[PDB]
């Protein structure tokens, strides 16, 4: 464990050195919730490596740099109402909760992963995270609107339900592209008259599967 954490601190230092982690909030979250806490034992020895790792049901937990990039873009503030689409391991949701300091909602379509995430969260002592079973491409009406919606799987287009569930001034961070595994990281800000889209560049994510994702 001490070994795993020391390797993790090196990872964090690297991200700060590369200018990936640039804010105090994100550094604090990363140091509080290392990725090894969210992966199966057989993968904990690779948790510090800056690339994605496998998780049950054929999915993956994103690479540290990607999670950092997306969190920095989110510019999370205490009290914000956040929705994550694609819970996976529960790692990103834990990081989010550490920054917003309130209830966090995250949705996952695979039952096995919903339980996987809940277990990781409980074991790590996270309390404010609610893991939901469902199709996140439809968002999560019960707690909308949101300050930020972070999608961790790639879509063929921007899901309309996600734009509708954003507070005016809120933002949707999502990988969108014409390929199942190759997308453009888009930051969509909701305005009083429509939206503003900022393209952050190429990324590679597992496909978002659902009504407003890949079918």
């Amino acid at each position: 464990e001490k070994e795993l954490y020391e390797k993790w601190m090196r990872t964090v230092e690297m991200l700060k050195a590369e200018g990936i982690i640039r804010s105090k909030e994100v550094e604090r979250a990363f140091l509080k919730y290392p990725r090894y806490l969210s992966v199966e034992d057989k993968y904990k020895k690779y948790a510090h490596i800056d690339e994605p790792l496998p998780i049950p049901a054929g999915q993956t937990v994103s690479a540290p740099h990607m999670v950092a990039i997306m969190l920095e873009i989110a510019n999370l503030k205490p009290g914000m109402n956040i929705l994550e689409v694609g819970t996976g391991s529960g790692w990103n949701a834990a990081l989010i909760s550490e920054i917003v300091k309130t209830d966090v909602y995250t949705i996952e379509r695979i039952p096995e992963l919903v339980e996987f995430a809940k277990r990781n969260l409980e074991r790590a002592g996270v309390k404010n995270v609610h893991v939901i079973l469902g199709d996140g491409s439809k968002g999560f009406p019960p707690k909308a609107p949101y300050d930020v919606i972070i999608v961790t799987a790639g879509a063929p287009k921007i899901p309309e339900p996600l734009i509708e569930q954003l507070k005016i001034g809120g933002k949707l961070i999502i990988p969108v592209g014409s390929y199942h595994l190759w997308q453009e990281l888009l930051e969509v800000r909701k305005t009083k008259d429509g939206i503003k889209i900022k393209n952050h560049g190429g990324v590679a994510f597992v496909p978002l599967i659902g009504e407003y994702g890949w079918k």
């Binding site: 690339e51 994605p52 690479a63 994510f205 597992v206």
Partner: peptide, 6 residues
């Protein structure tokens, strides 16, 4: 390398 990365 598995898919999420940049």
């Amino acid at each position: 390398v598995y898919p999420x990365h940049a």
